Each structure stands twice: as C-alpha cells, then as structure tokens.
Amino acid sequence: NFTQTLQKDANASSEFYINKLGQTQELEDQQTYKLLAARVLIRENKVEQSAALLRELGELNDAQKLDRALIEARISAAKNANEVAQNQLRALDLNKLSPSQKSRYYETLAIVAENRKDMIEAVKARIEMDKNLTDVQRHQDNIDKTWALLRSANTGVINNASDEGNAALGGWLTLIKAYNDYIRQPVQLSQALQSWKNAYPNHAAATLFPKELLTLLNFQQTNVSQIGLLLPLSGDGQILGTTIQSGFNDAKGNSTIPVQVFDTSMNSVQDIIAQAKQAGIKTLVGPLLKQNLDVILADPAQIQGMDVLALNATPNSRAIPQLCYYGLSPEDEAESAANKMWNDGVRNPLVAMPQNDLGQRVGNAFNVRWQQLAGTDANIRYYNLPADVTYFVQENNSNTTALYAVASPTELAEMKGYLTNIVPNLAIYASSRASASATNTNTDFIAQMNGVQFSDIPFFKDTNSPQYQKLAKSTGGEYQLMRLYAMGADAWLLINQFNELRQVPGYRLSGLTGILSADTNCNVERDMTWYQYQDGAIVPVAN
Ligand SMILES: [Cl-]
Numbered sequence: 384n385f386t387q388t389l390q391k392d393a394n395a396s397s398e399f400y401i402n403k404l405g406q407t408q409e410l411e412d413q414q415t416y417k418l419l420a421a422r423v424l425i426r427e428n429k430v431e432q433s434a435a436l437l438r439e440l441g442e443l444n445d446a447q448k449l450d451r452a453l454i455e456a457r458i459s460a461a462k463n464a465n466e467v468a469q470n471q472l473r474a475l476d477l478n479k480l481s482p483s484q485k486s487r488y489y490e491t492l493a494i495v496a497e498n499r500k501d502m503i504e505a506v507k508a509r510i511e512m513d514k515n516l517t518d519v520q521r522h523q524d525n526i527d528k529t530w531a532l533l534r535s536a537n538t539g540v541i542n543n544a545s546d547e548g549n550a551a552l553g554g555w556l557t558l559i560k561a562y563n564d565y566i567r568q569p570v571q572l573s574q575a576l577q578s579w580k581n582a583y584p585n586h587a588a589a590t591l592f593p594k595e596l597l598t599l600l601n602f603q604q605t606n607v608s609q610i611g612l613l614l615p616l617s618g619d620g621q622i623l624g625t626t627i628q629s630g631f632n633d634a635k636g637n638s639t640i641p642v643q644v645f646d647t648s649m650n651s652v653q654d655i656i657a658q659a660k661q662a663g664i665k666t667l668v669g670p671l672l673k674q675n676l677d678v679i680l681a682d683p684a685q686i687q688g689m690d691v692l693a694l695n696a697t698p699n700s701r702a703i704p705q706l707c708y709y710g711l712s713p714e715d716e717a718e719s720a721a722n723k724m725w726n727d728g729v730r731n732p733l734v735a736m737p738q739n740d741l742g743q744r745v746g747n748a749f750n751v752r753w754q755q756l757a758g759t760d761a762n763i764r765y766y767n768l769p770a771d772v773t774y775f776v777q778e779n780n781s782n783t784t785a786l787y788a789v790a791s792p793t794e795l796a797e798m799k800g801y802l803t804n805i806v807p808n809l810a811i812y813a814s815s816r817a818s819a820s821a822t823n824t825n826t827d828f829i830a831q832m833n834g835v836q837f838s839d840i841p842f843f844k845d846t847n848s849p850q851y852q853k854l855a856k857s858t859g860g861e862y863q864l865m866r867l868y869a870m871g872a873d874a875w876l877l878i879n880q881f882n883e884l885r886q887v888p889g890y891r892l893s894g895l896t897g898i899l900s901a902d903t904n905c906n907v908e909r910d911m912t913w914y915q916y917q918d919g920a921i922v923p924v925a926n
C-alpha cells in the first residue's frame with residue numbers, strides 16, 4: 384500500500400515528486416505524489432503553487448483527505464489566516480496522525496503562534512513537535528527554532544513565567560532566564576549553562592544544545608600575555624603600518640603586555656609565524672595586506688593554537704578556529720547601508736556598484752543583509768560611467784525608493800547632477816569613499832552633494848577635540864590615514880576582548896571605527912555612523 388508514504392517524512396524535492404506523476408499510472412498514487420509535492424512546495428516557499436496543486440486533487444481516500452487537511456492548515460498559517468488555521472487543525476482527530484504528521488501538525492501550530500507574536504505558546508507547540516521528530520537534523524532545527532523564539536520574547540514576561548506543570552517548558556524557561564540574567568557576565572553565564580545541563584539531564588536541549596549556546600558553555604576569559612604585531616613598516620605601505628601602529632600604541636597606553644613587532648615588508652609571513660611560535664607568542668594582530676592574509680588562509684594550520692586578529696578580509700576569508708577578520712572593508716559600509724535604508728523606510732533600494740570585482744563583492748554584501756531584513760533581493764546594477772545610473776533610477780523609481788552608490792567624490796557629484804532633473808527628491812546613500820577633506824573644501828561639491836547622507840567612522844563627530852586636532856594636523860588632513868589610526872586603536876580594544884567577541888553572540892563594542900560586532904565567520908561587522916550633507920555642513924544623523 385503506497386498511500387502509507389504520506390505518514391512518513393518527505394525528504395525529496397518538489398521537482399522529484401511532480402516528475403513521478405507521469406511515471407505513475409495508478410490514479411490513487413498520483414494523488415499521493417501531488418500531496419507529497421504540495422507539502423514540500425511550502426518548505427520551498429511556493430505556497431500559491433502548493434495551494435494550486437491541491438485544487439487539482441480529485442477523488443481522495445480517507446488517508447489522503449487527512450494529509451490534505453494538514454497542508455490546508457499549513458497554507459493558511461503561511462497566508463496569515465490564523466483563525467482559519469486553528470479551526471482547521473482542531474477538526475482533525477489528533478490520534479489518527481503519525482509521528483511525522485503530528486510534527487507537521489504542531490509546526491503549523493507553532494507558525495500560527497509566531498504569527499500572533501505569542502512566543503511562549505510557540506515554544507509549547509515545538510515541545511510537542513520535538514517529541515514526534517526522529518531525524519537528528521530535524522531535532523536540531525527545532526531546538527534552535529525554540530531558542531530563537533525564547534530569545535525574542537519579552538524579558539519581563541520570561542522572568543514572570545510559570546512552567547505550567549510542563550517539565551520541558553521549565554527547563555527552557557530556566558535556560559532563557561539564565562541567558563537574559565547573565566549574558567553581560569559571560570563568565571557567570573558559562574557556569575550557569577554547565578549547571579543547567581546537570582539540572583535537566585533528560586531535557587531535549589541537554590542532548591542537543593542550541594548552536595548559539597555551544598560557544599558559551601565552555602567560555603574562557605581573555606588574558607593576553609604578549610602580542611605579535613604584523614604590519615608593513617617599510618617600503619610600500621609603510622605609511623599604512625606606521626599609522627596603524629600609532630593608534631595601537633596610544634590605545635596600548637601604560638599596558639605591561641610586551642608587543643613584539645614584526646615588519647612584514649622585511650620578512651615573509653611564513654617565517655614570522657615561525658618566529659612568533661618559537662617565541663612563545665600565542666596572540667597576533669595582523670597582517671594587513673590581503674596578500675599576506677592569504678598566506679595564513681593558504682595553510683591555516685600555521686596559526687594552530689594562536690589567536691589572530693587579522694587587519695583585513697579577503698574573498699578567501701572563511702571560518703578558521705581562532706581567526707578573526709577586522710578590516711575597513713567597503714562590504715561592511717554596504718551592510719550598514721542596508722540597515723540604515725531599511726530603518727528609514729526604504730523598500731525599493733537601488734544599488735549602483737562599479738563594474739569590477741570589488742563592485743560585485745560589495746553589492747553581494749548589501750544584497751545578503753537586505754535579504755535578511757526584507758526577504759528579497761535588492762536591485763543591484765553595475766555601471767561603466769556615472770551617467771548609466773540616470774537610466775537605472777528613472778526606470779525603477781517605485782515607492783519608498785532610495786539609491787546606494789559606491790564611487791569617488793567627483794563621480795557622485797556627477798550622479799546627483801544627472802539625477803536632479805530625473806528624480807529631484809531622490810534619497811541618496813553613499814559610503815565613506817564619498818567624504819574626503821580634499822573635496823569637502825568646495826562649495827560646488829558640497830552644494831551638488833547637499834541632501835546626500837553617507838557612512839563614516841564615529842571618530843569624525845567631534846572635530847573640536849584635542850585628539851582630533853592633534854591627529855588631524857599630524858596626518859596632513861588626509862581622512863584615509865585618520866581611519867587607519869582609529870583602526871589601530873580599535874585593534875587593541877578587539878584583541879583584549881577576542882574571546883568575548885568570538886564566543887559571545889551579539890557582543891558589541893564601542894570603538895573609534897564604529898560599533899564592532901562579529902558574524903558567524905568572526906568577520907568584524909561595523910555599525911557605521913551616518914552623516915548627511917545639509918547645505919554647507921556635515922551633520923551626524925544616526926549612531
Ligand atoms: Cl515532511
């Protein structure tokens with residue numbers, strides 16, 4: 384009896400099941416394949432295709448009518464028909480479903496709760512779901528889902544929440560309360576989590592701990608004994624390594640930590656790591672040059688047992704144990720733009736990138752962050768000449784439209800000039816590449832850039848400070864160099880909070896280059912400060 388395949392999980396693709404329709408000549412099995420395909424189309428976020436395929440279902444037998452209802456209730460939950468979904472589930476004899484069918488029952492039930500912003504209930508549904516799951520990966524996904532729901536719940540409600548006689552809910556409430564009570568004390572949280580596992584040894588999360596909490600269970604406080612500083616301090620890039628070094632030492636202050644400096648322009652990164660290793664050094668800052676960083680990435684076993692805060696990030700950057708990437712990368716300024724534009728209400732962002740490798744990498748960075756906030760791709764378009772943007776804008780000027788463009792100051796001046804008569808009220812966003820002292824001394828540039836807002840480091844907020852004037856004068860007024868000094872200062876901040884940054888999720892630091900945080904690849908993200916050209920001045924707006 385092939386109809387029983389609806390009681391087991393459907394692990395194949397929708398394309399697989401549809402393609403079995405032609406190969407099946409028994410009408411009863413075709414309806415089964417349509418049901419199997421229709422319920423995976425939802426997992427593939429094709430609800431309207433799933434519903435359309437259910438309307439094609441003709442004569443069904445009671446076993447098929449049952450699985451049809453589960454999908455009908457899952458579709459309603461996806462269409463935010465919460466009242467309908469509930470009344471459709473309750474109409475099913477819950478004792479007639481299989482464990483796989485019960486997991487879909489409660490998953491729909493959890494989706495309804497989440498739609499209504501009822502986190503506690505959503506957790507209670509996934510507790511029932513978990514009891515009916517068998518695949519380890521399905522367990523893990525449910526565990527992490529449950530932890531996401533608990534983490535998004537109101538902290539005040541959690542502290543005042545009863546287990547309701549449900550042991551599994553108890554174990555969860557204890558876990559999330561410990562996290563909320565001790566995340567700012569990561570050493571104490573670790574001690575709580577280890578104790579949680581011994582308080583609820585038979586709890587589901589005790590066997591499969593949430594992935595966010597795996598790095599915290601065995602957390603360790605950062606304790607830097609000595610540093611190796613890898614920078615280009617001679618030849619090409621000397622000004623870059625010297626300026627970065629200047630910030631690092633000023634942030635260093637009266638620290639007793641010995642810092643052994645290595646000049647990467649006088650030695651190979653291969654031998655530096657060797658010297659550092661024999662030297663007992665277990666903590667490196669740098670290198671800076673992308674080519675030097677790729678040496679480590681060409682054989683990550685070189686930094687075995689070391690904590691490395693690279694001062695750059697390359698396309699080959701990835702997740703390596705005890706490696707973090709802190710660069711002034713235009714990819715981060717593009718991600719901060721996706722956050723800024725989203726908060727400002729933009730929903731049709733137009734991204735103009737240069738037609739080069741950098742433009743594709745920065746444009747992808749924006750798209751990724753926009754997919755998270757909006758669940759859709761951004762309209763990226765590369766340009767040969769700044770004029771090409773004028774055609775790009777006038778053809779996609781939907782509602783709540785805004786432009787993002789990475790380009791030199793002189794190039795942006797052209798873009799906003801050609802876009803004046805085309806979209807006079809256009810909202811324009813740019814990166815730090817738009818702001819330079821060699822161009823902020825103008826009246827035409829600042830007048831033909833009025834209204835434009837751009838990201839840059841927070842250090843430029845206070846231009847009347849002693850440090851700014853002392854640094855601004857010594858650097859010759861070159862913005863790019865000041866950004867390197869700041870970077871060197873923040874590298875000291877980062878290296879001493881390396882473990883927190885690497886193992887504490889959401890950990891944020893207030894540095895001179897922005898709000899520093901790490902993603903899953905310990906790629907140091909920067910929440911940029913946003914300034915806006917208002918007539919003749921530069922006014923901070925956000926962060
Ligand atoms: Cl399934």
Ligand SMILES: [Cl-]
Nearest residue numbers: 670671672675
């Ligand atoms: Cl370097």
